[PDB]
Structure formats: C-alpha cells, structure tokens
Design a protein around this motif. Structure first.
Motif, PDB file in Angstrom:
ATOM      1  N   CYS A  95      55.764  29.614  -1.914  1.00 42.61           N
ATOM      2  CA  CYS A  95      56.597  29.779  -3.097  1.00 42.61           C
ATOM      3  C   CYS A  95      57.992  29.224  -2.869  1.00 42.61           C
ATOM      4  CB  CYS A  95      56.681  31.251  -3.484  1.00 42.61           C
ATOM      5  SG  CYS A  95      57.314  31.543  -5.144  1.00 42.61           S
ATOM      6  N   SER A  96      58.475  29.263  -1.629  1.00 45.67           N
ATOM      7  CA  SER A  96      59.843  28.836  -1.377  1.00 45.67           C
ATOM      8  C   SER A  96      59.948  27.340  -1.112  1.00 45.67           C
ATOM      9  CB  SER A  96      60.415  29.634  -0.211  1.00 45.67           C
ATOM     10  OG  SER A  96      59.697  29.376   0.972  1.00 45.67           O
TER      11      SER A  96
ATOM     12  N   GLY B 222      54.736  33.383   0.566  1.00 44.00           N
ATOM     13  CA  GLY B 222      56.189  33.357   0.632  1.00 44.00           C
ATOM     14  C   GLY B 222      56.725  31.962   0.903  1.00 44.00           C
ATOM     15  N   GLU B 223      56.263  31.350   1.996  1.00 43.87           N
ATOM     16  CA  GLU B 223      56.657  29.988   2.344  1.00 43.87           C
ATOM     17  C   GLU B 223      56.205  28.986   1.297  1.00 43.87           C
ATOM     18  OE1 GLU B 223      57.670  29.167   5.796  1.00 43.87           O
ATOM     19  OE2 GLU B 223      57.639  31.232   6.542  1.00 43.87           O
TER      20      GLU B 223
ATOM     21  N   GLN C 201      64.249  34.972   0.361  1.00 44.41           N
ATOM     22  CA  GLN C 201      63.226  34.993  -0.674  1.00 44.41           C
ATOM     23  C   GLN C 201      61.827  34.813  -0.099  1.00 44.41           C
ATOM     24  OE1 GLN C 201      63.846  31.941  -3.591  1.00 44.41           O
ATOM     25  NE2 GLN C 201      62.370  32.774  -5.048  1.00 44.41           N
ATOM     26  N   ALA C 202      61.715  34.226   1.094  1.00 48.22           N
ATOM     27  CA  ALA C 202      60.403  33.953   1.676  1.00 48.22           C
ATOM     28  C   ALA C 202      59.679  35.204   2.171  1.00 48.22           C
ATOM     29  CB  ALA C 202      60.544  32.955   2.825  1.00 48.22           C
ATOM     30  N   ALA C 203      60.337  36.362   2.192  1.00 46.30           N
ATOM     31  CA  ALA C 203      59.694  37.611   2.569  1.00 46.30           C
ATOM     32  C   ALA C 203      59.539  38.566   1.394  1.00 46.30           C
ATOM     33  CB  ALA C 203      60.471  38.290   3.698  1.00 46.30           C
ATOM     34  N   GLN C 204      59.845  38.111   0.183  1.00 49.03           N
ATOM     35  CA  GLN C 204      59.955  38.958  -1.001  1.00 49.03           C
ATOM     36  C   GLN C 204      58.619  39.378  -1.604  1.00 49.03           C
ATOM     37  OE1 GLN C 204      61.702  40.372  -3.523  1.00 49.03           O
ATOM     38  NE2 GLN C 204      63.880  40.003  -3.126  1.00 49.03           N
ATOM     39  N   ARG C 205      57.498  39.200  -0.901  1.00 43.34           N
ATOM     40  CA  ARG C 205      56.182  39.455  -1.471  1.00 43.34           C
ATOM     41  C   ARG C 205      55.263  40.150  -0.478  1.00 43.34           C
ATOM     42  NH1 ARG C 205      57.624  34.590  -4.047  1.00 43.34           N
ATOM     43  NH2 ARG C 205      57.352  34.683  -6.322  1.00 43.34           N
TER      44      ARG C 205
ATOM     45  N   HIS D 277      51.729  40.095   2.069  1.00 44.10           N
ATOM     46  CA  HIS D 277      51.153  39.176   3.040  1.00 44.10           C
ATOM     47  C   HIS D 277      49.639  39.338   3.054  1.00 44.10           C
ATOM     48  CE1 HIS D 277      55.316  39.494   5.068  1.00 44.10           C
ATOM     49  NE2 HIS D 277      55.263  38.380   4.359  1.00 44.10           N
TER      50      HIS D 277
ATOM     51  N   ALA E 230      58.338  36.445   7.892  1.00 45.79           N
ATOM     52  CA  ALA E 230      57.999  35.765   6.648  1.00 45.79           C
ATOM     53  C   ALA E 230      56.626  35.117   6.612  1.00 45.79           C
ATOM     54  CB  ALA E 230      59.052  34.691   6.328  1.00 45.79           C
ATOM     55  N   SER E 231      55.983  34.857   7.751  1.00 48.93           N
ATOM     56  CA  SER E 231      54.678  34.203   7.757  1.00 48.93           C
ATOM     57  C   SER E 231      53.974  34.474   9.072  1.00 48.93           C
ATOM     58  CB  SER E 231      54.805  32.692   7.552  1.00 48.93           C
ATOM     59  OG  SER E 231      53.542  32.062   7.654  1.00 48.93           O
TER      60      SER E 231
END
Ligand code: SF4
Ligand SMILES: [Zn+2]
Lengths: 431, 66, 107, 143
Positions: free
Chosen positions: A218-219, A215-216, A5-9, A11, D95-96
């Motif tokens: 939100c998670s 992402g991070e 879920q942490a990559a679902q958006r 950047h 992811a970041s």
C-alpha cells in the motif's frame, strides 16, 4: 511519513494459503511539465571564444549587486567604476573574481596552496586585493560587490563584501493526500560488487510491488515517480561498455512496467562532455522504448512535479567547487552555490561548457522549492530560509554502489527520509 | 559609401556593446538591444539598405586566423 | 581542378560501401548499430575535452577574461593547435547527425 | 489442492536439489506472489511439525523503521534462520515479515539467490507486472 503508514494494518503473510490476496493501483500523475528548455541545444555551433560568456554574466548580474549594496551599506551610495577611483576614498566596486593559483595544471585530492592571490577584474582592467577577505573559500568566477579604498601601492583594501543572494519564489498549492518521490543515483553497472546486485534487485522489487505485506504494497503504490540521476555505468578503465547497456535496458524495462522513470546522463555515460549534456540516444535501448513511461533527459534538469518545482544536477558542479576550495561539507557547498545565484560559477575555467553568446543560462531566474545534487558520498538534508519568505529544501543523494541508500521525498510535508537495503553477507557469528 | 564603412568600424570597437569577434554584426546589434544597453538607430539603417555583402555584414577581423 | 566537383558521396560507417541515401548504416550491417553509435561518441567526448582546455589557456596567457584574444605567435604551439580542433569538432559533430536526434526541441 | 503444491515442492526441493525462491515458485505454478509466500510457509510448517529434524534451511525477510542518530530510516533485510529475533529486537517499528527461501545444503553468502531470480527472469521477459500487486494504467506498449 512512509514507514509510519506501512504498519497501519493487519499482517496476513505468516499464514496458510487463502482465497483472495489484495491488489492496488498506481496513483495518477495528473500534472507534469518539463521546463528545461534552455539546456536542450538544437543548433550547436562551435567556433566562438569564451569571452562572450563573462561579459553577459557581468551585464546581467550587475543590478542585483547594486540593489543589494544600497540596502546593505546605506543609500548614501558610492558605487564607482574601477578606473574612476581616487587614492584613499571610500567606494563600492562590483566585479568578477579571478583566483591566481599555482599548482593548477596547464596543458604543457585538493589543489589549494598556502599562497594564492585574488584579483578583482572588470571589462577594462584588474586590481589586486588584500585585507579582510577569505583567501581559500572563494573560487574564480564569482561576481560580487566590495567596499574600500585604493591605497598607495596600487592595491585595494577591503572592509566588507556582499554576494547576490536568493531570487524570488512564488508559493506552491498544498496537497490533499501525500505522494512520494524516490531519488537514486550511481548504480554502477559494470563493476562494484555483488551485494550491489542484490541491493538493486531488492530496490526494484520493493518499488514494483513484489515484496512485503499489504503495508509495504500500500505504501509503495503511493510513490508517484522515479528519478535516476547520473553515473549509471561506473567505468573502471576506458582505454565492457557494450554489455552494460543491455543490462541497463533490462532494468529500465522492469521499471517502465509500473512507474514513470526519468533518466539523466552523468560523469561516465555515452553523451558529450560540456555542461548542458543532451539526452541519451534511444538506439541503445531496444526493449524499454516500447512503453511511454520511460523518459530520457540530460544534465541540469528542471521540472514541475505536482506543483512542487525541482532542479538538479548529477554532481559535477559541487565536486568541481570541492577541488579548488577549502569547504568539505557537500550540503554546505550546495547552499553556497545557492547563495551566489549561480549553479556553476567555475565555468568555464576548470569545468567545460558550451560557448554561449546570447545569455548565460546558469543564473537562477527564480527560486526552486527543492534543489538536489548528485553522486555525494553520504546522505544529508536540510531546510534553509531566505531574507524574504523563501524556504528551500536541500538534499544530497548518496551513491548506491557503496552505501545502498536512496531517498524518499514527501510532497505535502516536504521532508526526506533515507531507505537502505542490505542482504545478509558471508556472516557467521560462531567464529 | 566610404563614410558608411567607418561608422561600422566604430560600432565594432566600442566596448559598451560587447566583446564581439566571433559572431555577425546584426546579431551583436540585436544582443545589445535585448539587454537595451543603447544601440544607435544608424548602425541598423545601413544593414537594411544592403544585401548580403561580406564587407558590411561581417566583423572587422573575420579573416585573420585568430 | 576536378577536386571541386565532389558529389558528397556518403559512405557506410561500418564497412565503407558508397551508396544512395543519407542513412549512416548499411543494410547488411544494420543489427550492430547500437555498438556503432557507442563507438565514436567516445571520440566526440574526447574532442570536446580538448577544445575547452586550449581556448581558455589563451585567456590566461593574455591576461584578460573579458576581451578578445589576438595572438598569432608562430613560436607558440598554442597557435594552430587551437585551429585544428575547431575543424575536428566540426566534422565529428556532423557525422553523428547522420543518426537522428535524441528528442524534440520545440516543445 | 494442498497435495498438489505439497508434492511439487517436495520434488523441487529434496529430489532435484534446487533453490526455491518465492518468485521462482510463482513463475513455475502461475501463482500470485503473496499466495506463494503463504504456500512456502505452509510447506515449512507441515514438514517442521512432522519431523523436527529435516534437511531444511530457511531464510526470511524483515523490514521496518529505525532510528540511528535522531533520523528515522527504513531498514529492509534478508536474514538467515539463526539471527531473526535479535534483528527483530533492534528495530523500532515492524512492518513486514514473510518467507524468502528454503534450501537443502547450506550456502555461504547471498550469491546464488540473485542468480536464480535473474535466470528465471531471463526467459520470462514479456511478463513481470503479471503477478504484481500494483497494476498501473498508462504503461501499455505504444511506441
Ligand atoms: S596562442 Fe599560445 S602564445 Fe598565443 S595567447 Fe594562446 S597560449 Fe599564448
Ligand atoms: Zn555496411
């Protein structure tokens, strides 16, 4: 689970400044119930002797073993007291082990030795045991049923034997949106490196909402609770401890700002020594007691976090069994502890406890959905099944000072994922 | 009296109620009743028609530095 | 004779000044209270560890784990070394109840 | 606007010879954390497009999933300026990515990057959830 879920958006952070940046909110914790009341000791009178505990252990554990030996060996039952046995006759005996090991220290690294005897003991007398039985897997204090005959030299010949097993387990309600729970153990504030310092900083910076993209953020906003489990101040030598409670107070302040926290005493922590360890006194934490999100518990901790019920220790039963047995796998030792229906069967003989007299509280009266341990040297997790419809997730929490690893438990899929933190060290790839 | 002092001395050494030389007499009577082993309703009916006397409401060896 | 008429005069844990009321710390030595609680709980912790090593040794020297110990053997160091730790623990447990309780118990 | 923080960073970095993390540059100028990362990326992009040979060193952060032996772990790392792309290609899911710090003269390990954040926390103790992306509700000083 989480990193999916942490990559679902999208950047946004490799960009020049903007007008707005997003914010979020912490998810509500709309059900919680502490049910660890048999471990909170209000009166605390010593001056008894340790014989009241074994007697109530046998008296409570006897019908479970009778009812399992019936359906495990046939209802043509031959259960008999240890004195009413006739020579060479087939019967079933229910008793308490005692392992007679030399090399166990008296008053004036493993400790198993190639010769050591087992003795089945009841309230009135004892008997020796040989035959088909494991000599080094079993420990003193387990209650069990056994099948065989009294031979001519006074000894007993064993064919097969059975343990108490899992207790009943009611089912949990299913959840709508997934909530997570973080488990950490053994920060070791007082000594243990500088990479542990940046690891602790990166961990609190991720969970508080200072680090990473939307992402991070939100998670980590979905992480509902934080449980710190024992051994907060690792100590190099007792005879240092005063300056460490200041830093622990600062860290618990920086965590009490955003999340709810539960803090448990460990092997070195300023509490008592016996096994129902009482909560830490609030007079050592000036700063962090401003907020009502910080909570202090003790050793055996039960809870009901959002329907899912938890039970855990700081890893004092499992290492005690590891001392006086032959099993190595800590996840296996945790499951074995589950199999004999007792959190700590080696108490009191090599692990000290309070001298109770009314009821032994380490017998499982129900089955927990999650069952974790404390300061284990490596990560592990597993799912096990009961005879009935009973499923249990087993987690061993690693030790932060060496591995720098914590665990995320999902509360809807009931899975556990590791999280690891590692800043760069003195690393130069041109040598 | 002198017959009530042997009934209590007989309740104190029966092994099917527990290993009791650290606690009181009425606490052991209620401990067995909870588990319901078989406490008899006569070792109760002399611990009610007396006050706090130390030769009724105490175990046999409540002296004796053990 | 006079020794029985003790008024149970309480005393400051920091600087030994007799005073009215039951609180453990003195008004001049109140700031250093977290350190004075830290000190002496590592003493209770070491008395707890000595109670348990002794009172279970009698169970292995006696033979049984399910019945009472009766051994007043005057040539054993075990006897009367198992008697004084009960009183050390009795005294050191009551000195820490000068401080309040670390939480509720009726919840 | 832009010249404000551009000159502030140019006097913090190259004149006083300091080490600027994002949390220090958000406690100095009173800014949100993500906006502070964007500020640092703006400064490094301007001064790396202008000249290409400055006395400027960067350190980034990379986070994301991984599989070592079957299991899915989540690896978070603070990385130097040479080794970024290899660490990015070892990972499975990304992811970041943002910026962590800039320097004048190169350090040897991750030593002072904890000293800076610790000291700027030490004097600023009544606010840590002030510039945080997550604002809980039940945590207000009551007891
Ligand atoms: S007091 Fe000493 S001699 Fe007596 S049972 Fe205990 S250890 Fe043995
Ligand atoms: Zn004083």
């Amino acid at each position: 689970m989480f990193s999916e879920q942490a990559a679902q958006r999208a950047h946004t952070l490799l960009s020049p400044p903007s007008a707005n940046n997003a914010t979020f909110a912490r998810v509500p914790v709309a059900t919680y119930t502490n049910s660890s009341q048999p471990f909170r000791l209000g009166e605390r009178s010593f001056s008894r002797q340790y014989a009241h505990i074994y007697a109530t252990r046998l008296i409570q554990m006897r019908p479970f073993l009778e009812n399992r030996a019936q359906q495990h060996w046939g209802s043509g039952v031959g259960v008999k007291k240890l004195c009413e046995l006739q020579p060479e006759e087939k019967c079933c005996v229910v008793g308490t082990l005692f392992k007679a090991m030399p090399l166990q220290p008296s008053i004036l690294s493993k400790y198993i030795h190639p010769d050591d005897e087992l003795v089945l003991e009841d309230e009135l007398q004892r008997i020796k045991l040989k035959g088909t039985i494991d000599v080094s897997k079993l420990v003193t204090g387990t209650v069990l049923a056994v099948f065989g005959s009294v031979r001519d030299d006074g000894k007993f010949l064993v064919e097969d034997y059975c343990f108490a097993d899992l207790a009943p387990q009611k089912p949990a309600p299913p959840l709508d949106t997934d909530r997570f729970v973080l488990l950490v153990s053994g920060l070791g504030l007082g000594g243990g490196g500088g990479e542990s310092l940046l690891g602790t900083q990166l961990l609190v910076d991720v969970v508080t909402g200072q680090l990473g993209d939307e992402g991070e953020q939100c998670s980590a906003a979905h992480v509902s609770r934080v449980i710190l489990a024992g051994n907060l101040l690792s100590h190099s030598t007792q005879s240092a401890s005063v300056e460490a409670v200041k830093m622990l107070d600062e860290i618990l302040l920086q965590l009490s700002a955003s999340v709810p926290v539960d803090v448990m005493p460990g092997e070195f922590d300023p509490t008592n020594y016996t096994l129902p360890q009482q909560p830490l006194h609030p007079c050592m934490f000036p700063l962090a007691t401003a907020y009502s999100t910080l909570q202090l518990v003790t050793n055996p901790y039960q809870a009901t976090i959002d329907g899912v019920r938890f039970l855990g220790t700081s890893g004092q039963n499992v290492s005690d069994i590891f001392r006086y047995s032959s099993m190595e796998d800590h996840l296996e030792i945790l499951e074995w502890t589950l199999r004999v229906r007792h959190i700590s069967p080696t108490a009191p003989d090599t692990l000290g406890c309070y001298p109770f007299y009314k009821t032994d509280p380490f017998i499982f009266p129900e089955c927990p959905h999650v069952y974790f341990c404390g300061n284990t040297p490596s990560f592990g997790s597993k799912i096990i099944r009961g005879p009935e419809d009973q499923t249990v997730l087993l987690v061993t929490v690693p030790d932060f000072s060496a591995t720098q690893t914590a665990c995320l438990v999902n509360l809807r899929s009931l899975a556990c994922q590791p999280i690891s933190f590692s800043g760069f060290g003195a690393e130069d790839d041109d040598l | 009296e002198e017959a009530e002092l042997e009934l209590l001395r007989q309740f104190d050494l029966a092994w099917q109620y527990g290993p009791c030389t650290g606690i009181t007499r009425l606490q052991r009577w209620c401990r067995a009743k909870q588990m319901g082993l078989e406490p008899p309703p006569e070792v109760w009916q002399v611990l009610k028609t007396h006050p706090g006397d130390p030769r009724f409401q105490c175990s046999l060896w409540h002296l004796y530095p053990l | 004779g006079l020794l029985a008429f003790a008024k149970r005069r309480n005393c400051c844990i920091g600087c030994r000044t007799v005073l009215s009321h039951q609180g453990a710390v003195c008004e001049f030595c109140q700031p250093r209270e977290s350190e004075l609680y830290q000190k002496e709980v590592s003493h209770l912790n070491a008395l707890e560890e000595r109670f348990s090593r002794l009172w279970t040794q009698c169970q292995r020297c006696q033979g049984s784990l399910h019945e009472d110990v009766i051994c007043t053997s005057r040539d054993c160091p075990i006897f009367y070394m198992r008697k004084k730790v009960r009183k050390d623990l009795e005294d050191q447990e009551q000195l820490l109840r000068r401080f309040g309780p670390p939480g509720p118990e009726a919840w | 606007a832009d010249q404000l923080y551009l000159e502030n960073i140019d006097e913090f970095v190259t004149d006083q010879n300091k080490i600027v993390t994002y949390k220090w540059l958000s406690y100095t100028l009173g800014v949100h954390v993500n906006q502070a990362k964007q500020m640092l990326y703006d400064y490094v992009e301007r001064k790396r497009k202008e000249n290409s040979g400055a006395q400027l060193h960067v350190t980034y952060l990379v986070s994301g999933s991984l599989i070592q032996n079957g299991h899915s772990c989540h690896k978070v790392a603070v990385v130097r300026e040479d080794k970024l792309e290899a660490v990015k290609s070892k990972l499975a899911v990304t992811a970041s990515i943002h910026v962590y710090s800039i320097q004048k003269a190169m350090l040897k390990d991750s030593g002072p990057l904890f000293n800076t954040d610790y000291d700027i926390l030490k004097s600023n103790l009544q606010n840590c959830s002030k510039f945080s992306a997550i604002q809980c509700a039940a945590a207000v000083p009551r007891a």
